[PDB]
């Protein structure tokens, strides 16, 4: 079946090159296409009988993009790949659908991969435990800033900076993982996505620097470089 479908504005915005590395695609001016949202597959078929380019929208994350230059009404998906992509719709209404939609089919396959029945039951099951990962590691690393500081023996500082640039990048992953399960158990529920500010907030400095390599520390941005690691 098709969750929904129609015609959009395809312009790639960043992809996962080999060796964990995020980069802005070649300046391709917004292209055309039509497309239907079959479960996890986001097929794209041409003007006026077989799609001429695919997109397996798994676990991915779409954030609004009303920020973009001229062409108003804009979307933005972060592919489990580490890929970036940006579709431009007809109205904030259609902006709802494909978004609240896609976000659905994605979190959907999730319900499946984990062989569970109730949507919100998996989400809530993931939502909870996730933070548990937080406070335990969100502290585990804190505790180190509390020792590495008072320590001075060079060998126990290089093993500290370790489980830190380590616990920092496990922290990151974690939350950007929540904004998923949530902005998913949120579409599925009807209330607006969470706060895109809170998202960035807990985002790594070193990790932010890169978000500076490319462009605008974008919600998508730190959801992009985020997976190129995964």
UniProtKB/Swiss-Prot annotation:
Provide the effect of residue 205 to A.
Reduces PARD3 binding
Altering residue 182 to A: what's the impact?
Answer: Reduces PARD3 binding
Subcellular location(s) per record: Cell junction; Cell membrane
Q: Which residues form the PH domain?
A: 2-109
Tell me which domain of life the UniProt entry assigns to the organism this sequence originates from.
Eukaryota
Q: In which tissues is it expressed?
A: Highly expressed in brain and testis and at low or moderate levels in almost all other normal tissues. Found in virtually all analyzed tumor cell lines including B- and T-lymphomas, neuroblastomas, melanomas and carcinomas.
Quote the PTM field: Ubiquitinated.
The UniProt function text for this chain reads: Guanyl-nucleotide exchange factor that activates RHO-like proteins and connects extracellular signals to cytoskeletal activities. Activates RAC1, CDC42, and to a lesser extent RHOA and their downstream signaling to regulate processes like cell adhesion and cell migration.
What does the domain comment read? The first PH domain mediates interaction with membranes enriched in phosphoinositides.
Membership in a protein family? Belongs to the TIAM family.
Assembly and partners are described as: Component of the Par polarity complex, composed of at least phosphorylated PRKCZ, PARD3 and TIAM1. Interacts with BAIAP2. Interacts (via PDZ domain) with CNTNAP4, SDC1 and SDC3 (via C-terminus). Interacts with CD44, PARD3 and MAPK8IP2. Interacts with EPHA8; regulates clathrin-mediated endocytosis of EPHA8. Interacts with NTRK2; mediates the activation of RAC1 by BDNF.
Listed name of the protein: Rho guanine nucleotide exchange factor TIAM1
């Amino acid at each position: 079946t098709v969750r929904k479908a129609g015609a959009l504005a395809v312009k790639n915005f960043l992809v996962h090159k080999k060796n964990k590395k995020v980069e802005s695609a070649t300046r391709r001016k917004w292209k055309h296409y039509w497309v239907s949202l079959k479960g996890c597959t986001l097929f794209f078929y041409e003007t006026d009988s077989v799609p001429k380019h695919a997109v397996w929208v798994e676990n991915s994350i779409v954030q609004a993009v009303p920020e973009h230059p001229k062409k108003d009404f804009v979307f933005c998906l972060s592919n489990s790949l580490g890929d970036a992509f940006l579709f431009q719709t007809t109205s904030q209404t259609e902006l709802e659908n494909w978004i609240t939609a896609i976000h659905s089919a994605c979190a959907a396959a999730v319900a499946r991969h984990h062989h569970k029945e109730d949507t919100l039951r998996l989400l809530k099951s993931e939502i909870k435990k996730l933070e548990q990962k937080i406070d335990m590691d969100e502290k585990m690393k804190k505790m180190g800033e509390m020792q590495l500081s008072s320590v001075t023996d060079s060998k126990k500082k290089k093993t500290i900076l370790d489980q830190i640039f380590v616990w920092e990048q496990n922290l990151e992953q974690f939350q950007m993982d929540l904004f998923r399960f949530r902005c998913y158990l949120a579409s599925l529920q009807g209330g607006e996505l969470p706060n895109p500010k809170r998202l960035l907030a807990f985002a790594s400095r070193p990790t932010k620097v890169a978000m500076g390599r490319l462009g605008i520390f974008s919600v998508s941005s730190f959801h992009a470089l985020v997976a190129a690691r995964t």
